[PDB]
Amino acid sequence: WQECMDYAVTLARQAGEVVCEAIKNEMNVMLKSSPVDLVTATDQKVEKMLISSIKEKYPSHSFIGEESVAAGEKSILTDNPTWIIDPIDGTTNFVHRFPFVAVSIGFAVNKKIEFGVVYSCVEGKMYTARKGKGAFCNGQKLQVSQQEDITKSLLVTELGSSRTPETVRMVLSNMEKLFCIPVHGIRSVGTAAVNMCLVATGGADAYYEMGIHCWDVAGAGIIVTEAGGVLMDVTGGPFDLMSRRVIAANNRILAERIAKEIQVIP
Amino acid sequence: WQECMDYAVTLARQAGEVVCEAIKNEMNVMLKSSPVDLVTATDQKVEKMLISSIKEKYPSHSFIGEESVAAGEKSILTDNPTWIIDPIDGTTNFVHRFPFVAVSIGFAVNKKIEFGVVYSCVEGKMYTARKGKGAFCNGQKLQVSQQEDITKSLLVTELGSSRTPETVRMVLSNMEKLFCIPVHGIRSVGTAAVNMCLVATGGADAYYEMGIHCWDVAGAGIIVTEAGGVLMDVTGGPFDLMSRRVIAANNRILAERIAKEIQVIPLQRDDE
Ligand SMILES: [Mn+2]
Ligand SMILES: [Mn+2]
Ligand SMILES: [Mn+2]
Ligand SMILES: [Mn+2]
């Protein structure tokens, strides 16, 4: 499986080079499901540019991609080598030239993630990881922090794209509870994938979010666990790919504490 | 003023070298106000250095400094050449190695800010700005976004260090109001100096916050405005440096809108 990996990292460093060429241009922003749910050409162009080259070398494999699922291809996962893509995680960052934008690839076989690649291109930081072989950014091994005390932890989370009043009120409600535990802080850089990568590094101790997707967590998740962290559902139950709710923490002590605190948005 | 300023930039960079050296290893983390209000030896070390360096060649000047004020000194700004110093902006980021800690320096003469130097050592970025000569990150000139539609806005703010309940309530409230305009989003990187530098580059359209001190915005503020941005009080009034309140927007139109939506949080000023 060590070839699919190196291939993936080349794709990503390439895709990323497009995204970051694009960033500095004027763009047409298109919407999707709401006036805050955005996409641009590059999101689409890059994703097609990804799915082509992979299947043009790996044609047996299935693909789950974010924007392809949008234009009508289907979000179902089998045991077949599936490449799981998010061409630009951080589209609003992208649209705004806010410097956190990531190309995320995840290769799950038998519905289990085998490796992940997350390239943050404004930064020049290539995160990669390989089940049972370690996590790295730019050729430097990562390891999560040690803090087992919630009251001394720095959490990362996102506010969401839902402006559904009830969905918003639980988002902030949960932030309030955790904030008041208290914890040292809550931070957001604009992308589920780079957030999870900051946790893999030890710069933060846990990340939590309800309402994410396959492709959001499919590259960075295995980078967290291989830096020594744990992935969990917001409910204190197990994390599967299709769950839509995650907690990527440094350890189970912290994961379980966050879970105890926050009410699930359905 | 250039003399004083070109000295500042070099001091920022020495301070920066120290902070990003210290961040790699073992730390003494102590409390100021609370369980959450932290400070390290490096914070205090750096302020004393920065001040011992300036008072040397320009002893005629004053200094407001975060940790100086904490050891009993007073944050009354006058017309004297004052240096306004935050030795590490982002001390919690620092404690965690979450990679945004700025060294901020602001120079006031007759109570108007002349120049500012924010250096974010991890990033390798040196934002500067002299009044009238524009703002630069690392040489390259900066310019704020041209956006004037609140509903297409990316905003940055902080949750504050207060866990005083009625305050935290008000904080998340003012957030909800803006989120539900809607705006495209809201980010927090962890330091008011950097959050504002980002507004200055146009990566974000507007930062706001109640609960800051003069040393958080003294240096970053002139970078924003010199980038073409605006500063304002949360009341729509002109920015007061001592008020503990700030909107740094890309333009009056955005700044006035955030101003309209958010409730004013009761805080004691820096001059009381
Ligand atoms: Mn995306
Ligand atoms: Mn995404
Ligand atoms: Mn400070
Ligand atoms: Mn500060």
UniProtKB/Swiss-Prot annotation, chain B:
It is found in: Cytoplasm. This is Inositol monophosphatase 1. Mg(2+) 2 binds at D86, D89, D216. One of its GO terms (biological process) is phosphatidylinositol biosynthetic process. GO terms for cellular component: cytoplasm; cytosol. Changing S161 to A/I: Reduced enzyme activity with myo-inositol 1-phosphate. It comes from Homo sapiens. GO terms for molecular function: fructose-1-phosphatase activity; glucose-1-phosphatase activity; glucose-6-phosphatase activity; glycerol-2-phosphatase activity; identical protein binding; inositol monophosphate 1-phosphatase activity; inositol monophosphate 3-phosphatase activity; inositol monophosphate 4-phosphatase activity. Activity with myo-inositol monophosphates and D-galactose 1-phosphate is inhibited by Li(+), Ca(2+) and Mn(2+), but also by Mg(2+) at concentrations above 3 mM. Its EC number is 3.1.3.25, 3.1.3.94. Changing E209Q: Strongly reduced affinity for myo-inositol 1-phosphate and strongly reduced enzyme activity with myo-inositol 1-phosphate. It is linked to Intellectual developmental disorder, autosomal recessive 59: A disorder characterized by significantly below average general intellectual functioning associated with impairments in adaptive behavior and manifested during the developmental period. InterPro entries: IMPase, Inositol_monoP_metal-BS, Inositol_monoPase_Li-sen, Inositol_monophosphatase-like, Inositol_monophosphatase_CS. Substrate binds at E66, I88, D89, G90, T91, G190, T191, A192, E209, D216. Optimum pH is 7.0-7.5. Keywords: Cytoplasm, Hydrolase, Intellectual disability, Lithium, Magnesium, Metal-binding, Phosphoprotein. Mg(2+) 1 binds at E66, D86, I88. Homodimer. The modification Phosphothreonine is found at T164. The lineage of its organism: Eukaryota, Metazoa, Chordata, Craniata, Vertebrata. Belongs to the inositol monophosphatase superfamily. The keyword Transmembrane does not apply. It is an enzyme of class 3 (hydrolase). Its cofactor is Mg(2+). It catalyses: a myo-inositol phosphate + H2O = myo-inositol + phosphate; 1D-myo-inositol 1-phosphate + H2O = myo-inositol + phosphate; 1D-myo-inositol 2-phosphate + H2O = myo-inositol + phosphate; 1D-myo-inositol 3-phosphate + H2O = myo-inositol + phosphate.
